Amino acid sequence: LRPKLSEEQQRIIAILLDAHHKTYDPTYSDFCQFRPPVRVNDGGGSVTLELSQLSMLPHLADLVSYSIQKVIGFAKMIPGFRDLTSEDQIVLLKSSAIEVIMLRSNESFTMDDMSWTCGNQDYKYRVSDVTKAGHSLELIEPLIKFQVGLKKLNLHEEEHVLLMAICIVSPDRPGVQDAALIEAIQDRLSNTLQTYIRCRHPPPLLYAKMIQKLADLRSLNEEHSKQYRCLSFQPECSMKLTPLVLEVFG
Numbered sequence: 001l002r003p004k005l006s007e008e009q010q011r012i013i014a015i016l017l018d019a020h021h022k023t024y025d026p027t028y029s030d031f032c033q034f035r036p037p038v039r040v041n042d043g044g045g046s047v048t049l050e051l052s053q054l055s056m057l058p059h060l061a062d063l064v065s066y067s068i069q070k071v072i073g074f075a076k077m078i079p080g081f082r083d084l085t086s087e088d089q090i091v092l093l094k095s096s097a098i099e100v101i102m103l104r105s106n107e108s109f110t111m112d113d114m115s116w117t118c119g120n121q122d123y124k125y126r127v128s129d130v131t132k133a134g135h136s137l138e139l140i141e142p143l144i145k146f147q148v149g150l151k152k153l154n155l156h157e158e159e160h161v162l163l164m165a166i167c168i169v170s171p172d173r174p175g176v177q178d179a180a181l182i183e184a185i186q187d188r189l190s191n192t193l194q195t196y197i198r199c200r201h202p203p204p205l206l207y208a209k210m211i212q213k214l215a216d217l218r219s220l221n222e223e224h225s226k227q228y229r230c231l232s233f234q235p236e237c238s239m240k241l242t243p244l245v246l247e248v249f250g
């Protein structure tokens with residue numbers, strides 16, 4: 001059976017599309033306001049050199065900080081999110097922040113050359129740029145594989161926004177108080193996504209493949225946390241980050 005989308009489900013999708021359009025600028029016009037990207041010579045991928053310079057960290061920290069602000073705005077518009085206690089809201093935002101950033105970045109990712117292209121060459125991010133920010137291949141390679149796999153699903157924008165919303169409103173995040181309420185909110189979003197796929201997604205499993213990407217994100221979250229810890233050990237590193245980044249990942 002392929003039941004039609006209820007009026008409420010249609011409304012939820014409309015609200016989420018609007019939220020995304022207001023919080024994700026496809027022209028990347030604000031990027032010139034971030035601290036400039038600096039790319040030192042490191043063809044050898046020297047960990048020692050990368051840590052001593054962290055040349056790309058200020059720019060990426062600013063990009064991520066900016067993105068967390070946009071994610072906060074997006075989350076506030078998810079139907080039901082405001083009904084949660086502020087304590088639960090913050091817990092969900094802090095624990096999903098890096099995951100939603102990885103998801104939303106798929107919009108700028110291109111399989112032409114496996115990079116995140118955000119306008120001019122100055123804002124094109126490749127694997128080598130991430131290593132210049134202090135991260136290792138243990139995170140980057142799996143990150144790229146994730147991007148390609150998500151790209152191949154060819155999600156409708158409707159599916160893309162629902163997935164980011166479901167990622168944020170997850171009842172199994174450590175620290176949540178009212179798991180039952182959170183689960184109710186997520187179920188409403190999940191049922192909307194499942195109904196949309198059966199009804200609006202033409203042939204040629206997609207729902208299952210999407211749920212699996214959420215599990216993949218948990219692993220990337222874990223690895224990023226481990227690497228952020230190592231990064232924080234570097235003297236003078238805090239100055240290369242931002243107060244928001246320090247709080248969310250610290």
Ligand SMILES: C=C1/C(=C\C=C2/CCC[C@]3(C)[C@@H]([C@H](C)CCCC(C)(C)O)CC[C@@H]23)C[C@@H](O)C[C@@H]1O
Pocket residue numbers: 057060061063064067101102104105106107108109116118125130133135139224228245
């Ligand atoms: C941000 C956005 C973009 C790209 C995401 C990328 C490319 C560069 C490296 C990033 C920022 C990854 C880094 C592993 C995260 C490092 C962060 C830190 C230095 C604090 O540990 C995660 C997602 C990656 C651009 C645009 O799509 C908006 C989006 O919102």
